[PDB]
Amino acid sequence: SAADRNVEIWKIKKLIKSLEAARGNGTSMISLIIPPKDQISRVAKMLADEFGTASNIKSRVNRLSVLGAITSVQQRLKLYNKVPPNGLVVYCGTIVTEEGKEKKVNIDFEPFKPINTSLYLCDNKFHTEALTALLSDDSKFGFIVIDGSGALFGTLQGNTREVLHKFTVDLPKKHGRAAQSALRFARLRMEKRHNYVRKVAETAVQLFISGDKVNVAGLVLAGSADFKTELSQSDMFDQRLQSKVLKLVDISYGGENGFNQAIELSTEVLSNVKFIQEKKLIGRYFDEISQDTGKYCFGVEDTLKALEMGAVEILIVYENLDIMRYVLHCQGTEEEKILYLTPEQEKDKSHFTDKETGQEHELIESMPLLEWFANNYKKFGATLEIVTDKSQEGSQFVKGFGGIGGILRYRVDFQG
Template sequence: FCVVVQVLFCLKMGNMESDDKFGFVVMDGNGALFTTLSGSTRELLHKLSYDHPKKLGSGLQAARMSYLVHMEMLDSYLSKIGALATQYYINPLTGQPNVTGLILAGSSDVQVQLMKLGLFDHRLVAKLVNVVEVSYGVENGFNQAIEQLSDILANGKYTRERYLMDMYFGEVRKRPGKYVFGVDGTMNVLESKPGAVKTLIVWDNLDINRYVMKNSLTGETVIKYLNKEQEGNTENYKDLDVEEKMPLLEWLANENRRFGCAPELVTNKSWESYQFCKGFEGIGAILDNRIALGDGEDT
């Protein structure tokens, strides 16, 4: 293995000004790059190259030997990545991570092997922002990873998002927890229990519209929240005339004074926020401790 120590370099990245420092490990089958990004300043810490084993002749026996040598060298390469990550992203004085978050980027095969073999320090696993697959290695892969995650890395947004997700999933883990999730559950509490919601969390790309409809037979006003798929189902409009249609995210922003809380927007780019958007419908709320849900209401 050849470890090349590089010098500090800086590069302007538009509006990415933040005090948060993120660590990046970019890796593929040819080498690994260890860097940090703080605002618009990048620091290249180490570059590790992987020397592929030479072919050991021809024939079945030689192929087996080549495979064994390759696996031994790969294990050593992955162990070196894990050790260098600990060396550069753990403060030796405090024993704690020295970065706000950590991003693994590169070949998915290498990433899977690294995590599967348990070669990554558990203190750094807790700091993982995301694991992204990029088409390139080393410097070009670093640029691609930044581009993919630019909206969450900019202006300290990750710190706020991590704080919100920690609070929300902290309530989810409690029994009972003071939280609601999903469109129906969240909107029911907002509409029926003013002041009950302490923190309203919404995916910034929530693709749901709020409909105000009137039943053509009874004259009753009906409120529905429909995603794209549901909008294509004619059963959702049976005997109903649409009087108003508005993106739910926009409606929540307009009505924040009535509910006493403005929506806190999150991306789906971190592990926690991706789980929130995928498994919790991208909308949920932390409830005020002084407000209790009635019997039979799900949280």
Template sequence: MEKRHNYVRKTAELATQFYINPATNVAGLILAGSADFKTELSQSDMFDPRLQAKILNVVDVSYGGENGFNQPIEPVIRYTFQCEVYTREADINRYSLKNNSTGEIVIKHLNKEQESNVNNFRDSNGSAELEVQDKISFLERFANEYRKFGCSLEFVTNKSQEGSQFCRGFGGIGGILRYQLDMRTLDGEVYDDSE
């Protein structure tokens, strides 16, 4: 029991040393392991309360070594909304622009370079200036609006091999169809399975 207590104490001290540090800027912790030490640590008075407040989950793992390390973090990498999002299209803002002479509302999605071009804030003839009615980050709009369309939203980080491949391959934005698509009926033509 004394060895268990010393182990929990040492782990709590090291966690404080490593994670209560402005340079690390830890947003959340996942305590994982196959034994009960993770639960003891999370409930211990020796564990810094600043870190206890950052515990996202306590996870039992089935494996040791690298597989055991990866088991609790794979779902977090795939599904967390706390992750850093890297996409070429993420740095886009959605503008609602009003043409004061016609009253028409124009929606434009502009990246930083396009925002610096004043022609993007003029009508198609270039004669009238468009007034900004609303500006919102493209990703923030997704995060606010996706439920209205019956979708689920997942952010993928480029910190994993799969996430990096996704960001490079799809430009960081992708979708999964909700219903099965019958490929044989595309474009009104019927294809048989041998084609």
């Protein structure tokens, strides 16, 4: 289900927030990630020698901490017997927190996406750079490696490299050694060679499409032998699929070994793509400003007022705002309100006296905005679009307009 997946992402994001905060005085913390294919024994051994080494650590508080963590991460791994699919992510240590409370913790879990990123570390802190880099890069891209020998269809995350389906074929010989039959055999060879392409072009629809919509934001075709092109520019390959043909890549090698080659030759394009789509969206946002229209908005005050009401269509936000939603509160009267304060206005501000009554209006702690949108953009109007300051249209959005706004579902006049 989609809702259960969104809960598991929120769970993991919250886990990361805590682990980045954690910290512990003295001590170290086992960052650890065991990729899908790995043998867990291999990990147990590694740990066991990492243990034996750590027993010569000169510092006590560090030593005994590290030994403890390694003792306990081994015990976690004992509860699994094969590596869970989609990898494993363990995070031992002895985190410190408020109240002077030294507490041990051992968070292991199969992460929801497969991942292809091993890591081991002892250091003062935990390392969750891998994990954030697997929530950021959703963008699944489809690969199809055509060759005279055979095909390979496969999907692709940031790091993760899946193999969907494949086959090979006995295509005919190049030549027909009779004078007349030469011509017929040629025409016949052309028919079976094309038929193979027809099969590939159907299979790709069968694999990379789902509910009359392609599941992959690109569709890299690869290979050699002027074949990938024969697919690329045919009437057989479905136009919604062929719309997202993103590259024809000439690879040496074929099949599985062909795959990796096809990805490394593709790397540059799949980066550009994410920026291209961003440029396109904001480009439209600006079109509504360029023409009078009315169906745009900008600056929290206006934008959220548009959201609250007959909502926006698309809401565009620069992926980090500073800007933060605070929940202000009164001591005596119990009257309360909420405000969207800038980095300067949030840090120190004499504004927040109650004035009418005459008391110090205390600001109960914040929830940072971009995250606030991410929580509850669905309870409004939808399509929360994170953007960047890399493109010229991107920067103009971030710099000028404030990296916040949205394309509206109809024309609205604003006042004050």
